[PDB]
Ligand binder design. Sequence first.
Ligand SMILES: C[C@@H]1CN(c2ccc(Nc3ncc4c(=O)c(C(N)=O)cn(-c5ccc6c(c5)CCC6)c4n3)cc2)C[C@H](C)N1
Length: 310
Amino acid sequence: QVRWKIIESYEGNSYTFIDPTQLPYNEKWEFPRNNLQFGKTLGAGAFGKVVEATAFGLGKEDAVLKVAVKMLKSTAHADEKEALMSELKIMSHLGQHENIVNLLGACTHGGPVLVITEYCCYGDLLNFLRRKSRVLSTLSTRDLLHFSSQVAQGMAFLASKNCIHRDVAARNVLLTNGHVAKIGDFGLARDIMNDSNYIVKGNARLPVKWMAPESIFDCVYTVQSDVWSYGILLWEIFSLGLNPYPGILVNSKFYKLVKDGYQMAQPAFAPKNIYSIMQACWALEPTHRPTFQQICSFLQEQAQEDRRER
Ligand SMILES: C[C@@H]1CN(c2ccc(Nc3ncc4c(=O)c(C(N)=O)cn(-c5ccc6c(c5)CCC6)c4n3)cc2)C[C@H](C)N1
């Protein structure tokens, strides 16, 4: 699966007392549907879509601002409504963080369910990288480090809530004001069917090139498997957005390689220290992978060194 999920953790640092899917919606998020003016469709998958809108009088400051609004398509049935509400329930439970696309409100009465989140004006990180890659201001190591750290903090936050992401990738990072990176559960805005990076596995479509071997082979999904995917994301960032495993098709030979410990070569713009993060993320043994907090800490050191020399 490609949506966010809360898991149970024992004798970990964080404890799951409740499953947010249960104990339904808190009507404190409720926002007047009529105070939404819809704009362009930002993206859409099989069951739902995300559209840009202006919201009037939203929040404590009740400002007028651009927001993103998620909603179902016509093809959506009961199963689809539940999953949307379930996504709403998780975002309301997680709480806020600077590097997550935050819940601003919802319309669950008087019409179709709408979920209102912060609008990220610059779009996805992968496109941004590929555009910067072919310009003639040009990106510097400090920018690439900042993206890396901001995503790492978002993921360290999720990990602290026993929440797994399951689709970490540059296509799934958004850039908002100041080009700050944010992550979120973007499935419904993702046209998975028409993105060839999602490979058909019988009944599912999975981002095979981003997935830890245990996720691919055992269908295991943990914070540690998210750490592997974050390493692939790092490789994307410091290659300025090449497709992972360049040239290498996804077929039985691909699986044997990753199984057997194959790892991508150092990207053009990764310092050796950043490549060492990638390698640590791609440890075959999941418990030998760093935590997101350890990654944050180490990236913090790389940023100060850059700030000292540069
Ligand atoms: C096609 C066009 C899309 N253009 C663009 C896309 C997204 C956003 N801004 C934004 N702001 C908040 C959210 C959410 O809150 C949210 C959610 N909560 O699920 C989901 N998306 C979202 C929408 C579409 C797509 C994705 C994510 C990934 C695949 C395509 C958001 N997008 C701004 C510009 C960038 C341009 C270069 N090319």
